[PDB]
Ligand binder design. Sequence first.
Ligand SMILES: [Ca+2]
Ligand SMILES: [Ca+2]
Ligand SMILES: [Ca+2]
Ligand SMILES: [Zn+2]
Length: 399
Amino acid sequence: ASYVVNNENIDKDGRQAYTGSYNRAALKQMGPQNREAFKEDKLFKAPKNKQPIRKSGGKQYSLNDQRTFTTIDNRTNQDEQTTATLKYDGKKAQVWVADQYITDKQAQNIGREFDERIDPLIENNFGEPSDVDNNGKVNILVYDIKDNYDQTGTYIGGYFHPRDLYNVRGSNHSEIFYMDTYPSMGTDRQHLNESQIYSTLAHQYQHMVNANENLFKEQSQEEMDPWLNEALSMASEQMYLNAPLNSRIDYYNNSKSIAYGHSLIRWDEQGDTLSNFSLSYLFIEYLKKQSDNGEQVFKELINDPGDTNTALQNAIHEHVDPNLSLSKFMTNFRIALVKKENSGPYGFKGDADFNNVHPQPISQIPETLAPQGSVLFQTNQDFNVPNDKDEDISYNKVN
Ligand SMILES: [Ca+2]
Ligand SMILES: [Ca+2]
Ligand SMILES: [Ca+2]
Ligand SMILES: [Zn+2]
């Protein structure tokens, strides 16, 4: 038969748990196509020093003014300093340009797409931004984000840092997110296509209003865990595109780290982050199909005042199943990826968007599995679940 093994511990900081002494009664058991399958971004953590910004009502900058911003070199993880020009001063977005290759037209396309589609989309379905500089607008700094693309082929499409909302070192004292030019817009610096990154505007803007709702509007001031913050950003991309994120599915299908038990809830900052993006994306889409209010569950997760696991558990009880615990919903997620049943917990309600999700069976179980790390294997015998496995490990017969 086949088995889905999962560490059911819902604590992302928990131990990697022993899977047991099992019997090799297992069967012995290409290439991510799109370059966009290797597109990352960075969501940085809010500072513990939440010194507020004080101002005394924000008609400082206008078209063609220059402004030097702190940006982040993701090769070395240092602050850098970048001087940009305001090239679009719109209804909500101010688009700053600091890449000589970007034309004024492209800045105007980006700002207009934000003003007309990105902003309403996010405000109505996720949340609304802060206004720490009392200027009614948000900054979009368009420039060549520094990363290891030239050496790896993995590139950073954009980022958001909640430090910009407080008075700390490196803050730009405003609502701002950062958008990459090369190679996000294309691999030819002289023929960049800015429409390539429009869904990334929704991605980064979700991070921004997420930080506002949870750090400014709610009294607990608890950040959402990265894995679910990132999942909600990719829910917003699909909603903007009204199409599945096929590159994240493509990456899922070819990821050896996922096949060997990559964690849904522990963000592998120094390792294969792309596998975290793929798992976070499929999870939020699984929650969408399993919720009776569909995409409307997204704003309830943000609006919930409790921590990340409490919000998910409340959403499951109200919209999915009042008796179902978060930890078993997560196991059902992994089985749903395999079975894709047309109804019930082991599928995506037959949504065609997810029919090309194909988990990869492996020949041997890893010794240990991180919290919500999962693997799939097949058996040539009536294999027996090991008796010395960690109690957090569930073996789930499927076929
Ligand atoms: Ca503002
Ligand atoms: Ca770049
Ligand atoms: Ca909340
Ligand atoms: Zn992100």
